Paper text:
Under this condition, five distinct Cryo‐EM maps were obtained: two fully assembled F1 complexes with different γ‐subunit rotational angles, a hexameric ring lacking the central shaft, and we also partially assembled complexes (a tetramer with the central shaft and a tetramer without it). The resolutions of the cryo‐EM maps were determined to be 2.5 Å for the two fully assembled complexes, 2.8 Å for the hexameric ring without the shaft, 2.5 Å for the tetramer with the shaft, and 2.7 Å for the tetramer without the shaft, using the “gold standard” method. The rotational angle difference of the γ subunit between the binding dwell and catalytic dwell in F1 anc_core was approximately 34°, smaller than that of TF1 (Sobti et al., 2021) (~44°). Comparison with TF1 structures identified the two conformational states as the binding dwell state and catalytic dwell state, indicating that F1 anc_core shares the same rotational catalytic mechanism as same as TF1. Regarding the catalytic dwell, all structural analyses of extant species to date have consistently observed the catalytic dwell structure. When the rotation was observed in the presence of 3 μM ATPγS —near the K m range for ATPγS‐driven rotation (0.68 μM)—six rotational dwells were identified, separated by 32.1°, consistent with the observations from cryo‐EM analysis. Based on this result, we assigned the three shared dwell points, seen with both ATP and ATPγS, to the binding dwell, whereas the dwell points observed exclusively under ATPγS were identified as the catalytic dwells. The analysis of the angular differences of the binding dwell from the catalytic dwell revealed a histogram centered at 32.1°. This angular difference aligns closely with the rotational angle difference of ~34° between the binding and catalytic dwells of the γ subunit observed in Cryo‐EM structural analyses, supporting the above assignment. Thus, F1 anc_core essentially follows a reaction scheme similar to that of TF1, featuring two stable conformational states (binding dwell and catalytic dwell), even though the binding dwell of F1 anc_core is significantly longer than its catalytic dwell.
The minimal subunit composition of F1, acting as the ATP‐driven motor, is α3β3γ1, with the γ subunit embedded inside a hetero‐hexameric stator ring consisting of alternating α and β subunits. F1 is the membrane‐protruding portion and rotates the inner rotor complex against the catalytic stator ring during ATP hydrolysis. Here, we used ancestral sequence reconstruction to infer the catalytic β and non‐catalytic α subunits of a putative ancestral F1‐ATPase. To reinforce the structural integrity, TF1 was used as scaffold to accommodate the functionally crucial core domains of α anc and β anc ; nucleotide‐binding domain (NDB) and C‐terminal domain (CTD) of α anc and β anc were genetically fused with the N‐terminal domain (NTD) of TF1 that forms the stable hexameric scaffold (residues α1‐94 and β1‐78 in TF1).
Author numbering:
A (entry chain F): 352 to 470
B (entry chain D): 2 to 470
C (entry chain E): 1 to 468
D (entry chain G): 232 to 287
E (entry chain A): 26 to 501
F (entry chain B): 248 to 374
Write the structure that this text describes.
Amino acid sequence: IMDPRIVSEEHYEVARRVREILQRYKDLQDIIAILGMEELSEEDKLIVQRARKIQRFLSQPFHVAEHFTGRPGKYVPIEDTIRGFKEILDGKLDDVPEQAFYMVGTIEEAVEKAKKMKK
Amino acid sequence: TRGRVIQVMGPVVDVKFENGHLPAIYNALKIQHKARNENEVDIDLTLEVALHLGDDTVRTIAMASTDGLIRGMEVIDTGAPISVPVGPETLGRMFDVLGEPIDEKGPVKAKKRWPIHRPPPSLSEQSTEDEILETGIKVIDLLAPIPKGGKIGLFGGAGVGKTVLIMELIRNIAYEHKGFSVFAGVGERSREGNELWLEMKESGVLDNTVLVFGQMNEPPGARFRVALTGLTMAEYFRDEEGKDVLLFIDNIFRFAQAGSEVSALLGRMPSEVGYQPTLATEMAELQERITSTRRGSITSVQAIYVPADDLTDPAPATTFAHLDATIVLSRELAEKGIYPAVDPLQSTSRIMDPRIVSEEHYEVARRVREILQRYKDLQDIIAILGMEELSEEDKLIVQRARKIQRFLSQPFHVAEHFTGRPGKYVPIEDTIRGFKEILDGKLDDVPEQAFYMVGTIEEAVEKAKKMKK
Amino acid sequence: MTRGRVIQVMGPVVDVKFENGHLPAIYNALKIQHKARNENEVDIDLTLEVALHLGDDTVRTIAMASTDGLIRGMEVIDTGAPISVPVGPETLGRMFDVLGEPIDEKGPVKAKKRWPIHRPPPSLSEQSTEDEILETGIKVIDLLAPIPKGGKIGLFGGAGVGKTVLIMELIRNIAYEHKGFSVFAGVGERSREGNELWLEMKESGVLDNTVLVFGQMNEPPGARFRVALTGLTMAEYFRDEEGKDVLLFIDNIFRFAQAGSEVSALLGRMPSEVGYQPTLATEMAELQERITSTRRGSITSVQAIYVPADDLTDPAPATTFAHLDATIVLSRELAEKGIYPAVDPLQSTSRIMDPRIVSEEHYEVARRVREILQRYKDLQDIIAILGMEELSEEDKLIVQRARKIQRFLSQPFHVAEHFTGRPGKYVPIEDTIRGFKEILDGKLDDVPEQAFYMVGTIEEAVEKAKKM
Amino acid sequence: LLDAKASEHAARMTAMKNATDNANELIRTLTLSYNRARQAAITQEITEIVAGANAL
Amino acid sequence: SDVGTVIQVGDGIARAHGLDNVMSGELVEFANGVMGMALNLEENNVGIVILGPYTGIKEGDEVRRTGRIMEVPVGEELIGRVVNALGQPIDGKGPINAKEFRPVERKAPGVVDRQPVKEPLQTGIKAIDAMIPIGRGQRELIIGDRQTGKTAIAIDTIINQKGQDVICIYVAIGQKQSTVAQVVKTLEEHGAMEYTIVVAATASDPAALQYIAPYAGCAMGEYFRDKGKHALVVYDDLSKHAVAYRQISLLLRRPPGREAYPGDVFYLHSRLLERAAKLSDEKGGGSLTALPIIETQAGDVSAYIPTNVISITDGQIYLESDLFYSGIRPAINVGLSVSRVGGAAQIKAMKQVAGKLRLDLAQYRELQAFAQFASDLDEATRAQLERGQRMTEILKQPQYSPMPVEKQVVIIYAGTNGYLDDIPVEKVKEFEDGFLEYIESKHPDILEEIREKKALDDELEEKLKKAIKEFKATFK
Amino acid sequence: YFRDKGKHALVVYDDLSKHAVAYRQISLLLRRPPGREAYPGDVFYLHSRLLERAAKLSDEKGGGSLTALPIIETQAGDVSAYIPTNVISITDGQIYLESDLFYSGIRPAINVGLSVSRVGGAAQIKA
Ligand SMILES: Nc1ncnc2c1ncn2[C@@H]1O[C@H](COP(=O)(O)OP(=O)(O)OP(=O)(O)O)[C@@H](O)[C@H]1O
Ligand SMILES: Nc1ncnc2c1ncn2[C@@H]1O[C@H](COP(=O)(O)OP(=O)(O)OP(=O)(O)O)[C@@H](O)[C@H]1O
Ligand SMILES: [Mg+2]
Ligand SMILES: [Mg+2]
């Protein structure tokens, strides 16, 4: 179904833009394993900063997982996933810390989770 | 005293001779059948004996498709191996595995026929004189000189440049040599054989040449015996007439592969990587016949297909002990657009001895290998540490090695469609002179992009001026 | 009596038929003794070990020597039992083959008894439950890698370190202090190395306390496979009848595993991982489960092992490590520096090292020695790039201590008296533990490093210092 | 500048120590994977050989 | 009876019915006049390996028993000749006219009949005689990648045996006839044919003949050994015998194993290589030594055939392709190559000098891999690198120019003591020839003293005086 | 037997890896086609026929319960291998033991981060 004809134009741009950043970060992965991220400069450094946030925002608390962790489960609509990833890609949430996107539902939850941390 | 077909197992066939007068190993058998009723099909086939079984039965390998064969047919024993026509009447013709003409010029009227299986020369009558044979190709003429009267092997994977290198050598060596030429297309594309035949017809080189084909679409029996048919014709010019001859062969790996394909159906236990238990023995009976005797010399150029760029596969590994010069083609240079893509470290020959070549030829060739071997180990480090962290001697070696590696490239006459360039010839003195200026640092100022598909070193300076530097 | 005839021959494998229907058991030994009838024939003195009951009154067998000159229809006899070898005190100071026949030109062996090579191991109702430490008298082994009585010890080391000297010194110490003999089984050995060992055993006077059994590399797979079991049945008699503690040396256990792999391929069995035999763990067990500490006496074993490609996960090293109780590592760097015996203190380990078996001070002295030697190995690359004066006072106080402790691990052996003036020294467990404890507290730091080099007990270092 | 050059050499010493340790760890993990591949290739090859010999 | 009839024929193997009294390993004759060896004794058929052309043997042809095992000729009469694996001439210099013939499958010398190896086998190669010494009665494996020098080290060694009372045998296995002709011609040019025998089983010869060649080579080499005289045998590729044996076994239908080789592949090389030995005084004190050669694919030192022979020999000499393509010749890796008879297979002169070489060279192998690029280090590290670079120039040597031990210990002594500290790394080769030219005038003095006394401890004063005064006076 | 009556019972297997090796031996002696590491295809069915027999019964059956503690040895400390992964797919969790923890004095040497109980949390007392 990932063809311009079936999905919405907004969905297709956001999904393709997500895979490009995740592929670019998998290319840097074999060199940072030795040297670390201290050598990286400009766009390669900014790409890993956004790729970290994107990789964590793909995590979701399930209802069947309540028996393993005290966190309640969540259901996220298609309009909310597209809007959340679009803002992460654009850089509107670059100031928020990477630990505020772990096991959340919608993008507004990341804003209050960051506000709870105060960092 | 005739025989009958008993089992038809694809390419392999079993025949029983009731009288007890069985055919010898390697003898040729004939199946000629006229259809009795509307259900049957007319058949014309030749089979060679491979093994003697117990109950008056023999295993045979067919040289053409076995479709339409029926159990109980009649088989005739010719009394000898596959016998091919020999003499000066074979010049300017094209042949099948059985030595029959595949061109439409009419029958061949040669007074004599020779069997494709013959014992090799003895140690007491071989010869080994050493001289440099020029190719006009910058890499081969410098780093791996071709020995006149010796075997040359071009090794490579799929699509690296082997056939484009054989074709350039035929258009250089044979075009600068008096005497006969022989070419055998062992298990290759029938489109390439057609283009070669037309190039010969145009140039007029067919008058001094012989061609043998039996291509990819033929059964396993024909694909392994074709190299022997081309060889029994090049042997007559050496042994009976005394002339020097060139033998060009493309894909000798198809001969090894075709022997493996029929081995399982004959009943032989398998061996390493799925090859026959007789690989080294079968390649030796081919390679040991292509040698220079007291009477005349056979210079030979062979192309070897490496199944997955792994020189350790049984067929390529078995081949290396028989050559006098070996040239390895690497996809690493081909992907960078550096053609003919010859590996300057792995390429070597029996002639790179200080007693045979000139003093500066020996020095320049050894210096090229050392600078490129040093650069090979250092380029790997640069990818993790970065070029800024290395010393001035390393930076100098990197800058010169890049230019040397690109100057090894040349535009071939047969490559005009692939290169968009006319093609060029470089003599040995210019190859030595050109590489020396790069090694001595004279052209450190010239850009690394002024050596791709160029000829003589004067052109690089003219090309840099055209590039406004 | 009953007799068979040869019906097939191909390499080391031979098949025999018994027409009367009386067939030999799965491990019996058969003899082929034939005198040439005509000038066309050759005389033979071969023996075969049974392997399978094929059916139709036929049996498959593995050969103990060459099968050249054999003819189909040649008669053969069943001995009614497995391979049997001489046992007792008369086997001390002698050389033997797989069959129990002597290699030495010292006449025949008139032993009172002969025992079969294949015997069941001792049961759980015959073993000893509480483990004892075998005192070797060698400071490094007794302190950092204790030897369990009835245990299996593994030797890993490079060429030119002194493995033979250690074996010879271990063979001595057990005979003099523990009043027990030793046995050496050369599994597929180089006949030139077997010669050097026999001459060094002869020159050191050690032969009278040991038995040497050799299976040479030039022997067929069947003979190289069973040589460890004939060495083991000779060590078994000293445990069961005399009640003494015994040492069994196996030069390379990998050659025993390899010989079984070759015999399995010849027999036609489907291979397992890396091409080894399907029976690799049962063959290793039938050897290793007979080396135990019974209530009467014990057999301890020192076994060297060859790692096929520096990979410890290979099936032969893997199946052996399952049976081992301790590991001894020999390094070339200690030998280049001058430390003997050349045993690595940071790579040698034993299951007996826990404080429930060794005393509290034995555990503390061993742990403190490893901590100081490990800390010194860190400083070695710092010492290579920068000077000794620059190090901190505490760092220098550990470098000095570590060099003195590393030298105090060294000991002058008794077998070494032919190559050096040093007479030789035996150090009890109680004396080495007492000695290292004084060194660790810094009581002897105001003493030269050469006082601890090639010495025995701690009082000798004090007197050596007073002499200088 | 004296403190800046000293701290630069100290920073580079720690960076190179970690880079060397990361590379040494990667070498043992790759070595173990190569040994698994080596043993897997040998058992697969020997089983294709024996299957073919059994079939024939 | 002693007669049979062929039932199956193919690929150089035959199967026959009858031959009830054949012995395992016997020779048999076909109606065609061709010979064969009986290797399998099935219940109803004999499996025969053919020792000649098999395209003339048909099913139903008769075969007869010869009542004899495989036997070859032996004696001094073979010296200077070229022969096949069956003991028949190839050089065309007339018949052999031998006095005795003996079996090819003799048992090896027992552990009590041997004696420790303590006398040298001088190869004349600076890297081998100093760092990887060979003694008479030892087995040393030459192993490496294709086109690295291997046949070169074996022939340079045979050329060095002209003065000593040693006989050499060269066994050409699976080799091309044109390379065999260049080897024979090289031996005739250097005068080595005065004391050598060449046994050949070339690539077009039957798999059977290429299998009996090394066993026939030992039968000829051990003949001098049983007379008290020293002998040397060389096998150009043991990797080619394993392949020839694999063919015969897979065609006789014997069970396959790792890389399709039969279970007795370790036993094949063990029966052969344990026959090299230094005998005891009761047996006359004779000595046979072997130089087997192995070809490794991309450095596969852990393959089945390389691991079998690496475990059987008394040491090995590893040759590497990256050393070869970088100018180090002979391309011997000193770090991985070992001799287990070191310190006993050398004269006292070499033992005293080579001790310093081992330490200087060992500290260099570790240091260049990392400290080569750095501009400023500690003076100790600079001196260790500079000494290691100079000693690795002294070990380089050209083909067909072996060095007598007296000349070797002099140059190594000069380098180890560090008199080359003022000589550039490119000038070290020029210094070897210049120093040896000054020593030509003193050859009468130092040849007799180093050859007779072998005492480099007493000689220190004369070596130091000549080397320092001659070069400092001329170079200033 | 105790579980069918109504009594609770525990069973321990000292090495499932040694059990698989003893099964590979007889399948290869019977000439059965080898798989992934010379082991027969039935190697999953082998550990499944046995581990499934452990179960907590319903009140209608008498409420008894059999529990099992299988043990596995893994070469070079890697969890992703044929026999280890087969049993990890059958059990209700796993306890990981590490060699660097053991040789450094941390005992019992249990990895708290990577060890989990899938049935766990419901079987603990409220305290
Ligand atoms: N000298 C050259 N100049 C430019 N392009 C080249 C040159 N040599 C080869 N190529 C390119 O690489 C391709 C290699 O084709 P080629 O026929 O030589 O394959 P090959 O190596 O012979 O493989 P195969 O034997 O299977 O036919 C060419 O078709 C062309 O695109
Ligand atoms: N010391 C040397 N100096 C210069 N060139 C050398 C030296 N030693 C070897 N070579 C060259 O390297 C090659 C080695 O050939 P050699 O026959 O010894 O190799 P090989 O391993 O036996 O090859 P092959 O397997 O084909 O028989 C030859 O070209 C030889 O002249
Ligand atoms: Mg092509
Ligand atoms: Mg060679």
